[PDB]
Design a protein around this nucleic acid. Structure first.
Lengths: 114, 208
RNA sequence: UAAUACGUAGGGUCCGAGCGUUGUCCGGAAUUACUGGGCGUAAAGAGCUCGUAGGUGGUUUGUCGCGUUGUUCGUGAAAACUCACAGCUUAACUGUGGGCGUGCGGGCGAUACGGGCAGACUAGAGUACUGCAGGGGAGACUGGAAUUCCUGGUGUAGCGGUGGAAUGCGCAGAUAUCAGGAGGAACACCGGUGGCGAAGGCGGGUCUCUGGGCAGUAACUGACGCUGAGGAGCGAAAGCGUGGGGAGCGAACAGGAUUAGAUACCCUGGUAGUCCACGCCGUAAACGGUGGGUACUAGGUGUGGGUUUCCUUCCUUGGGAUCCGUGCCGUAGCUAACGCAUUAAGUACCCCGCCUGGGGAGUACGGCCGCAAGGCUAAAACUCAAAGGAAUUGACGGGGGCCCGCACAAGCGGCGGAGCAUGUGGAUUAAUUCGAUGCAACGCGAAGAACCUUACCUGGGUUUGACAUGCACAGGACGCCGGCAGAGAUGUCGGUUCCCUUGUGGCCUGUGUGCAGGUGGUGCAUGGCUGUCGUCAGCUCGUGUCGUGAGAUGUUGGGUUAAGUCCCGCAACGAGCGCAACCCUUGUCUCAUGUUGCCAGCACGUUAUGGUGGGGACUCGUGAGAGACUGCCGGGGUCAACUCGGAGGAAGGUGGGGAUGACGUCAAGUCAUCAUGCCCCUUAUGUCCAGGGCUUCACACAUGCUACAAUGGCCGGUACAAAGGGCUGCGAUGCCGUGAGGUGGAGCGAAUCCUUUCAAAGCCGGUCUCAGUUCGGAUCGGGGUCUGCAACUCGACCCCGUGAAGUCGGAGUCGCUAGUAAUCGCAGAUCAGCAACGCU
């Protein structure tokens, strides 16, 4: 909020121009990093997990509470401890287009039937 | 010579002189007048702590100023102790003592007063842990304390050792030249021996 | 010397007619582990197998009731222990009545389990049949290269050896080279996380004799199996005995060589021994540091052996599936962790070995075996309070990878050589005041030691004092100006004898009471201040995840940097104190700013000249702001940073130098700048006094300068810098003195005036003409100046005469990358005048 409201307020060349370059870098890094705690505030609900094989290191971070961890399974990983798997296919763009609209469908209809 | 005084180093720019005058032949004279002044002051009154002492000289007037948050302890209420002060100052012969006494605004962001209060707490019978911790808390809850560093040293708690352990919080960039800094070095008695205390208080920047 | 841990004070806790100590036994001690432990590395798996006694044992039918199990009688003396009672003033103690008295003998009931008996079965086991490999062993015979050596040919003067050399082999004909011959060990490539064997261990080839192993059928017998105290047998290399043989290598041994000395690594020679036969010993890191045997217990992965369906060409790491053997990765699980993880260190039973703190000691004595060497079994006294295993942080490394600093290299001038200028060491000493101690001290605390300072010594006075303050008692004057005794301290006359306003005071005379003071000690009691590694780039925190924990992570890995500065991918996300930068000075420009300084354009003085009006134009002194920001170019570059050459500029790639010391160590230094906790002096380690010292020197160490000359010595003539200092002081011109110096004071709190209108190198003319010299100046004898009351220890300065060492410096070292180094001189804080040639 501070960073964005600074660049919104618009006070730049009262400081260093290279510092303006660096503030844009700050917002660029903070944008590749941060989308959702802008809106969260709600002690999140522990659910959708991704890329177990490559980042097994997330097993320690998320499961700790056991409130459901949930994904489309990975083909050959440390399987059944955690509450909610879903089989399927990992690879293909087309398959992903299909699953993407499927979540679009389920999420929008769950919103509507709220 | 590990860290010179930020007051003495920013003196040219950001902090300001404590005795303003001009003299050519009377310089030596005015300084010896001034030190005898401040010594008799501190030797007379010690129960409530002086925050600042400033002096100025003119053709015939003399303007001595004393900041302290607790005036009623320091001053003559009826005029007793303040007239005693004028008496000492007339023995030393300032000859026109417009003694403007003042109380400060923020006793907990006044570095010297805070160090003196903690030093008194130590010198009575007390430990240093709770005093240091509560000092940090009391300073940092107020608005302008952006960073502090409170540095207590001595035979702390009677441990027969030259010790040095400090508690800080916030931002204390002493190299930030433009920013106002307040320094206080105060040495306090104790049953075992003497303790030293230093405190740095950072305050914003200055634009100008 | 400052103890809650010693002795005593008070005090408090515990117990109580007892309280503590001693001695032994049990427990704690899961520390002999039947209940209830272990063997990969902590102590612990025999060197490996065969196997006697023994222990243990697949499936099923039937049977005995031996074990075992159930009840009953018999028994378990009494006293004990415990439950319920009664009583001894209760209790202690006593008795009553039970339970146990844990086991034993007889009968009876049960037969699941163990066992015995009579069988049977085929999954275990062995065998059989057919294939399959393989350095498995033993013997006989045999092969080629290669090394050395004896014959001869060509042949010449070295060859060999190392980090470098010499002993040595040769110069009588070596080495080298070539043909032949003699010889006795080891078999390059095949050959390797690769096969065989129980293990050690096994590879030139052919033959012969023999052994185990795997697979397929599973025809055959029907639990025969597993282990194994003892015991027997096998068993690397070295060593022993008898004989032969001996090329190479090679302990011992000899010589050369490095070395403080090298009985050692290096070199040159070389004996046993290594080799074969036959008898020995019986040890090893004989290590997978994991005893054997059987089964269950995710997979993936190479690789070896034999079977076999599928795509089948059906010739193939084809692929699939099973059996055996082998190496890597990996869950569960286990572990102190390291790590093992279907070839288990986990899962359970069978058998065995073995351990119970280290050291003494696997030693002694006794015995067995041994030709000997010596192996096996195997203690104790006594002593230590631990020895030890695994992993972490730090440091270190004559381990490594990547980097920077005048760290070396390059180029210059020095030290060490002589003279003296100062600062220390050691020894003198009545006193030579104290501290500082490689880097980070020694031109240090000093920035000016004759008295003073000064803290030290001889001699003298002082003692609530050299100066104060709190009390009261006795005071109203106290000092100051001159005199005398006096080295001075100090005691003594002449002149000063108050203003308050009746209560007392400024004040000082005493009396002592509180005392006042210390340069007396602890800088390892403390604070404060400061140097140092180091202006080197790092050092930490939050919250988290990992780890039983110390702790890790972030802060690892690439690009990249002056640097934890930055970018990129990741159990880290974020941040601070740091590095950068807003500070000063210098480097450029626009405007103003006009004297106490410039003075181009102008008019006026002319002996000294901006000297005077006049222009603020250039200078300019003082202030404010733009100018460097890889700013833009195009080729490179995770396209990111990071660079490469440009324009423009006064400066361009952190303009330059400055200021600035991350957390802390060196218990760094200063109780003598100062502050101060504790100990001591007090009739004195305080204190007032004059004299003397801190400058003693047969020497040592260190810092610097002045020199060893012609780029130089000497006279004379000519022009320029920056820069500051100043009042009870800087001192101008004139004149006199040789010259330091001098009455005197112009002008001056000072962009003016003293500061020659400010210099020395340098330039022009000439001499000296390479040598103890016109170099060099010590050192002394005298003639003198200034300041200070006072120049002997002890001051600086001019003049006369004086004329010493020194003819370019040793092993190594020091400082320097640009306006730097080397050289010339100036100015000054401190300071009356000085060693100041230091310091800035």
């Amino acid at each position: 909020k501070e960073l964005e409201a600074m660049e919104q307020t618009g006070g730049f060349e009262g400081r260093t121009k290279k510092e303006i370059l660096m503030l844009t870098r700050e917002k660029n890094k903070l944008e590749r990093s941060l989308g959702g705690i802008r809106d969260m505030q709600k002690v999140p609900s522990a659910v959708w997990v991704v890329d177990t094989n490559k980042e097994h290191i997330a097993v320690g971070e998320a499961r700790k509470l056991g409130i459901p961890v949930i994904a489309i399974l990975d083909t050959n990983c440390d399987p059944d401890v955690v509450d909610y798997p879903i089989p399927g296919n990992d690879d293909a763009i087309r398959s992903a287009a299909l699953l993407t609209k499927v979540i679009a469908s389920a999420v929008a209809e769950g919103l509507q039937a709220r | 010579g590990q860290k010179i005084n930020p007051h003495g180093f920013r003196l040219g720019i950001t902090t300001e002189w404590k005795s303003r005058w001009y003299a050519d032949k009377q310089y030596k004279d005015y300084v010896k007048e001034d030190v005898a002044i401040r010594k008799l002051l501190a030797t007379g009154l010690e129960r409530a702590g002086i925050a600042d002492v400033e002096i100025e000289r003119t053709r015939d007037r003399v303007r001595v100023d004393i900041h302290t948050a607790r005036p009623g302890i320091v001053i003559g209420r009826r005029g007793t102790e303040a007239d005693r002060i004028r008496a000492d100052l007339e023995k030393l012969t300032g000859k026109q003592v417009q003694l403007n006494i003042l109380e400060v605004k923020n006793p907990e962001s006044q570095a010297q007063l805070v160090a003196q209060g903690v030093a008194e707490q130590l010198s009575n019978r007390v430990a240093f842990r709770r005093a240091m911790r509560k000092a940090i808390q009391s300073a940092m809850r107020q608005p302008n304390v952006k960073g502090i560093r409170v540095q207590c040293s001595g035979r702390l708690g009677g441990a027969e050792m030259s010790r040095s352990e400090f508690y800080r919080e916030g931002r204390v960039p002493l190299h930030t030249l433009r920013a106002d800094i307040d320094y206080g070095l105060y040495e306090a008695k104790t049953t075992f021996g003497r303790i030293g205390v230093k405190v740095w208080i950072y305050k914003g920047d200055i634009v100008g």
